[PDB]
Each structure stands twice: as C-alpha cells, then as structure tokens.
Amino acid sequence: GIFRDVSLLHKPTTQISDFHVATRFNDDFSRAVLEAEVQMCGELRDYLRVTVSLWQGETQVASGTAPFGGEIIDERGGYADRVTLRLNVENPKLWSAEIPNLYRAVVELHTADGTLIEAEACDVGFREVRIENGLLLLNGKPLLIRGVNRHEHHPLHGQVMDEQTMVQDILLMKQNNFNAVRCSHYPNHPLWYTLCDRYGLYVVDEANIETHGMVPMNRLTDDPRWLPAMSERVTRMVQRDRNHPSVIIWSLGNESGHGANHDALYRWIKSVDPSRPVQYEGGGADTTATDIICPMYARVDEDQPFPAVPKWSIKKWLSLPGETRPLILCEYAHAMGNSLGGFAKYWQAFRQYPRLQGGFVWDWVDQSLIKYDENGNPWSAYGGDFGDTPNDRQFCMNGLVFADRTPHP
Amino acid sequence: DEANIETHGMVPMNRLTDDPRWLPAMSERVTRMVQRDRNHPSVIIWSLGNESGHGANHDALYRWIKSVDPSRPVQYEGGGADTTATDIICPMYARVDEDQPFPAVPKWSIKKWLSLPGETRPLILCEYAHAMGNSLGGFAKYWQAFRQYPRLQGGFVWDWVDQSLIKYDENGNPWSAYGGDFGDTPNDRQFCMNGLVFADRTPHP
Ligand SMILES: OC[C@H]1O[C@@H](SCCc2ccccc2)[C@H](O)[C@@H](O)[C@H]1O
Ligand SMILES: OC[C@H]1O[C@@H](SCCc2ccccc2)[C@H](O)[C@@H](O)[C@H]1O
Ligand code: NA
Ligand code: NA
Ligand code: NA
Ligand code: NA
C-alpha cells in the first residue's frame, strides 16, 4: 500500500531539474571549496542565471553567480544547460557525528535584472570520507563505527514513519553512545537523512535489493536480463541522497550473493560519486563489489568454516593474504531476546585492532505488531500471530529496544 | 644463517650500525658469510644479525644480499622487526593476544601485527617462548595461532640447550656452573640456561 507521503509539486516553466553539491579540502583541512553543479530543464536562454550562496545561520559566507554552460568535455563540447559554481570557504566547520555544524546553501535560478524564477535550498556538511592505507577516514581521522541497524517499523502503524518516532529513535541512539545508523535494507524516509544531518549520525544508505529466497542467492543478480531492474534500484537512490552529509557510505544491497550486476553497479557508484566508499556483503564480504569488508555476525576468535563463502574471525580476516581493506561488520551481535553475550569481546577487538572500525548491531527495535484480545487489551504479536504460514515466528524481534519503545536490558 | 653482528650493549643499540665508519666492518661480516654458505640447500633464509637496532648499514647490507642472492629471503629483527631491512616480520618473544606497548619499538600481538595498515610480509618469530628453567607455559596458544593464521608461519624457540659449564667440587664431583660461578662480575647469573634440554644432553619436561 501507499506507506509514504503523497504530494503535488508545482515547478516553473524554466526549472532547476537537478543540482549537486561536493566538497574538496586542502591537506590541512583548513581550506574548502564547494563545487556545485546545477542542471536545468529548459526552456534554455542566455539571460537567465543561477546563484548559489552558502549561509551559516543568518550570515552568508560565500556566493556564486554564473551563466549556464559547462566546460568542454568532448569534441562536441560541454553541457549548455548545466553550470558549475565552486565557492571558496575559508576555515570551515567540519561535519561529524560529534559536531554537526551544518551549512545552508541556496540555489536559485534567476533572470539577469534580476527576478528569481525558482529557488532551491540544501543543507551542506563539510567532511571527507575516504579510505586511505586501508582505513576508513573522516576528515583525516579514523572513525570507530558504533552503529546499529534500523528498520522503519511502528507497532501501531506498521511501516509508516512519523516525525516524532524518527526523533525519538535518534535521541535514544545518541543517548546510548551510537554515532551511526544503517538503514537496512532499503532507502529510508527523505526526512530521516535530514534529521541525521542536524543531530549528527553516520548513515549507510542501502539500495533496495535483496534476493535471499533464491537458489542460488545470486540467480537474479548474475542474470543480465535482471540488470536493468537492479540498476534502477541503485541509481535512483544515489541521485536522491547524494547531497546529504550524514550519508557517508553507499550500499549495493543485502544478500543477494555475488553477481556481475553487483560489480557493474559498484563501478557505477564509484564513477558518479567518488566521495563515498561502496560496501556490499554478498559473496563473502570480500568481493570486488565492496570497498570495505563487511561480514555478517562474523565472530571475534572462532571462525565458521563454510564452503564457497567462509566466515573468518574478524582478526583473522584482516590478516588474509592480499587484504588491505578495513573491516566493518554490517551486521553483528544478534540482539534477539536475551542477547549481547560476549558483546564486550567485539569492542575489545575494535579498540585494539586499527583496521577493525566497529560495526552495526542487529537490531535496534523489535518488529512486533500490536494485536488486541477479546477483552480488548493490546498484546505484542510476532511471526505467525496473524494466521500466516509459512512464517519465521519470533525471529522478527531482534531489537535493542521494544516497540513502544522501551529499552531492553 | 645469521651474520655475526650484534651490538646490544651500545646506547643506543644502533650507534655503530648507523655509523658510516663502521659500515666496512659490518659488510665483511655479512658478505663473507653469504659467499661461504650460499651453496647449502638447507639454508633457506639469510639474517643480518641480532640487535643491533636499525641503521643505514643494515638497509645497505640487506640490499646487497638481495642483489647477490635473490634465492633466499633476508630477515632482520632490529628496529621493530618491521623495518626495510627484513623480508619477514620477525618479532622477539612477541605475545599472542596482549601487546607490549613500548616507545619507538612497539611489540604488537602476532595476530595484530599482521593486520597493521600496509602490512603484507609474513610473521615468523625469530625468538619466542623463553624456555628458561620451568617454562613453555601458554605454549599451546602460539601453535593454535600458527595453525589458524596463514601468514603466521611459526617461529624459533629459545633456546635449545642450556649454556651451562661444568665445574668440579673439592671432592672432585662435577656440577653445572652458570653466570657468575667462575668469579666473573658483572654477570647475568642463570640467564645463560634457556635450553629445551640440558647439556649432557637430557631433555627437559
Ligand atoms: O533473524 C533473522 C536473521 O536471519 C539471518 S539468516 C538465517 C537466520 C534465520 C533464518 C530463519 C529463521 C530465523 C533466523 C540473517 O543473516 C540476518 O540478517 C537476520 O535477518
Ligand atoms: O635471557 C637472555 C635474553 O635476553 C633478552 S633481553 C633482556 C633479557 C635479560 C636481560 C638481562 C639478564 C637476563 C635476561 C633477549 O631479548 C633474548 O634474546 C635473550 O638473550
Ligand atoms: Na580500531
Ligand atoms: Na531477524
Ligand atoms: Na599458518
Ligand atoms: Na638468555
């Protein structure tokens, strides 16, 4: 059903069809340039302009006005409908989970006289996310990921998300020493990214692809005929959430095995957006479609010996011949019911081993639905309580908190 | 096969090995060894020495062996066992889980050492498990780690035989002497005996 908002948007005849925001930094991280690419749907003409200005509160730190037209990129020339505006920012505030420090950028298409045709705005965070010497870095500092996997779930409203529940979850996360959140395993609410920008939470944006039921798991993802469908699940996500500072990592999906489509889709994201590292778990979490090693529920010392896809110890995995990539557990420590036993082992290893930059806990909130007795009193329902078969019973509830949401011990 | 160079008593340990004037002496201790023992099949690894810190002479002497004999990898422990003068990481008595935090030359866990950013070389302990007297406690930990971790290709135990000398009582009966039993001072007492067997040579437990 229609589980997210429905809206009507009116645009002008000449519109800003698209705009991008990037941030480049000096090695001292004391000098930043904001290169903003702006696309328009025209209705193109010579006189109209585009002005991009950076605002810090009520103060404008920088601005840029330029006629449309791109630099020559081929023998045919450059884009006539596009324009590039790079703004110099001196000693800027850097975005992080610890210190948000958001910037406000206003992108407006206007005539040369001048009246503004359409005005667009975006929140800009100045940070850098790059893996260097096999270490995930934010602003030149190795970031230890203390994150948790989160499903968009409501016990009363299903998968419909209100603003109050998004805030409620974020506060509880930060109040329990969480700095990261992994929207698993689908693109979340557009407002969720906004909240993470201002509050300060590392976000791993995950594509809506998961073929866990197939045999083998990569039957569709290694099929060329299914490539067009998978690409649209990835490309459209990147185009929507590439402006958000809080998002630092792209994800191809979840459990979809390893196919040729993943490698192609991985290469595409790296091509369109070199700013964020791309991770993918399928194929043993050591495939060519991931910038980071992200094993699921891998253990600290003992390693599960499986054919084809072996799960190594998080300490052993790093030491494998030809390994340089860092290890961040996309999933670990199954918090189903009474759990997190030996949870201290993980975090002793996280702090000891440099390339072990933490992971994401599964899960944050129990996906339990509310039902009502004959007497009328409400009770938490799970798995096969709705007369559904075959089902996976209480396995739906693996959250660190209840659904109301009360914290588990 | 290990070269006859060790400057453990110097302060710092690389005072002579980082001295250009001492380079001619160190090279002759390395070059003449290689020329003599390069034909032997049993020798598989060259060694620059032992504890001599890390100097420019080591890097030059390392490069020389690689030049004359690319058949054998060259290892050297000094400088943190992760220097440019070694083909293999060979830490001394490094531990399996806990890592000794030392300035300049830090001793990491044998599991952690492999995972360090920019590490590709394998780890073979040139020395580990000090068999001084009643020892080899937690010796099973090393070999559990050796078999689990691919890049951990074991190591060399210290030591094989107790370096004890035989002396004689007034009655004539012989007794094992160590350290300062020969009226020598300053000495390092019973530390000379770290062998897996006695000197006769009877196996230790
Ligand atoms: O509890 C769900 C978990 O299932 C396991 S697989 C098999 C585990 C399983 C399968 C069937 C029923 C219950 C658990 C996944 O790896 C996790 O991400 C999580 O989804
Ligand atoms: O027992 C000798 C050992 O001494 C230690 S250093 C310092 C250890 C030490 C120093 C002085 C007296 C006794 C032990 C060396 O690293 C080993 O190779 C071995 O030679
Ligand atoms: Na770490
Ligand atoms: Na589950
Ligand atoms: Na091994
Ligand atoms: Na000794």
Side-chain angles (χ1 to χ4, degrees), chain B residues 3 8-9 13 20 27 31-32 36 44 56 61 67 69 90 104-105 112 138 145 157 161 167 174 176 179 185 187 195:
Chain B
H8 204 182
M13 203 183 306
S27 59
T31 56
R32 292 175 66 250
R36 186 188 72 141
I44 51 141
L61 265 42
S67 179
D69 200 83
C90 47
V105 179
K112 174 179 176 176
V157 179
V161 50
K167 289 189 65 60
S176 298
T185 182
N187 60 271

Side-chain angles (χ1 to χ4, degrees), chain A residues 23-240:
Chain A
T23 51
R24 263 173 39 249
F25 309 92
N26 57 333
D27 294 86
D28 297 26
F29 290 100
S30 56
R31 206 186 192 190
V33 177
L34 196 155
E35 47 280 275
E37 173 262 9
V38 177
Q39 288 178 31
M40 63 164 274
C41 179
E43 325 288 350
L44 188 274
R45 202 68 68 90
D46 305 320
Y47 70 111
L48 40 78
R49 305 261 177 272
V50 157
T51 304
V52 169
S53 60
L54 263 184
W55 290 82
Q56 192 173 56
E58 300 189 60
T59 66
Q60 175 181 294
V61 301
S63 189
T65 304
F68 271 100
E71 79 282 20
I72 313 177
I73 57 179
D74 274 324
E75 291 97 347
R76 300 295 291 172
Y79 292 92
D81 49 10
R82 300 185 180 182
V83 63
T84 301
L85 301 129
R86 35 193 70 117
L87 299 79
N88 281 342
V89 190
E90 311 86 0
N91 297 337
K93 297 178 182 292
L94 298 183
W95 190 96
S96 62
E98 303 168 357
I99 318 179
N101 287 338
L102 277 185
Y103 279 82
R104 187 64 170 182
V106 179
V107 188
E108 46 187 2
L109 160 67
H110 62 100
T111 71
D113 199 42
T115 51
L116 75 96
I117 309 175
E118 180 193 357
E120 283 294 336
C122 175
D123 293 277
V124 173
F126 286 72
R127 88 274 183 280
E128 183 178 2
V129 187
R130 68 140 162 160
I131 294 151
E132 187 232 354
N133 201 16
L135 283 175
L136 187 69
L137 302 182
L138 175 64
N139 303 335
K141 305 304 181 61
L143 64 164
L144 181 53
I145 301 299
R146 31 182 66 85
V148 61
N149 290 90
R150 176 184 175 271
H151 271 280
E152 292 187 78
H153 174 79
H154 200 283
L156 303 160
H157 300 296
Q159 289 164 8
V160 177
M161 295 306 303
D162 302 330
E163 204 275 350
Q164 311 297 272
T165 294
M166 277 173 345
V167 174
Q168 182 183 13
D169 290 26
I170 290 184
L171 299 199
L172 283 182
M173 287 174 181
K174 302 192 58 90
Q175 282 162 7
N176 291 278
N177 298 322
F178 284 98
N179 70 345
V181 52
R182 183 168 180 257
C183 47
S184 58
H185 299 95
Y186 44 79
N188 266 27
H189 202 99
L191 178 54
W192 175 258
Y193 304 99
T194 304
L195 291 172
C196 291
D197 294 326
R198 320 201 308 276
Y199 282 110
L201 284 179
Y202 301 140
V203 178
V204 176
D205 208 9
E206 189 166 12
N208 198 5
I209 294 97
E210 158 129 34
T211 63
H212 204 182
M214 310 281 348
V215 183
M217 203 183 306
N218 72 326
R219 174 172 294 274
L220 299 182
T221 68
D222 209 19
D223 198 322
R225 298 178 68 87
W226 278 86
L227 174 62
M230 293 179 56
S231 59
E232 301 281 7
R233 310 272 274 236
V234 173
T235 56
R236 292 175 66 250
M237 176 199 59
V238 174
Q239 293 178 286
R240 186 188 72 141

Side-chain angles (χ1 to χ4, degrees), chain A residues 133-135 300-303 313 315-321 323-324 351-355, chain B residues 96-99 108-120 147-151:
Chain A
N133 201 16
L135 283 175
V300 190
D301 289 345
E302 95 196 85
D303 42 10
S313 150
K315 299 173 176 176
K316 174 179 176 176
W317 212 311
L318 307 162
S319 311
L320 290 168
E323 286 288 358
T324 49
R351 293 184 169 91
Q352 179 179 6
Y353 291 63
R355 276 208 284 159
Chain B
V96 190
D97 289 345
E98 95 196 85
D99 42 10
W108 311 110
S109 150
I110 59 180
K111 299 173 176 176
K112 174 179 176 176
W113 212 311
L114 307 162
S115 311
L116 290 168
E119 286 288 358
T120 49
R147 293 184 169 91
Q148 179 179 6
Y149 291 63
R151 276 208 284 159

Side-chain angles (χ1 to χ4, degrees), chain A residues 302-368:
Chain A
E302 95 196 85
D303 42 10
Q304 295 78 297
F306 292 123
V309 179
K311 283 185 177 180
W312 311 110
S313 150
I314 59 180
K315 299 173 176 176
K316 174 179 176 176
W317 212 311
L318 307 162
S319 311
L320 290 168
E323 286 288 358
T324 49
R325 299 171 288 177
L327 194 150
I328 295 140
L329 295 149
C330 63
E331 258 136 277
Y332 79 106
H334 209 251
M336 181 179 179
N338 214 325
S339 298
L340 263 70
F343 181 77
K345 285 189 177 184
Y346 276 103
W347 275 102
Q348 174 180 296
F350 290 161
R351 293 184 169 91
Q352 179 179 6
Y353 291 63
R355 276 208 284 159
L356 290 182
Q357 285 165 291
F360 296 89
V361 179
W362 183 283
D363 217 33
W364 169 249
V365 50
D366 288 341
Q367 287 188 301
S368 65

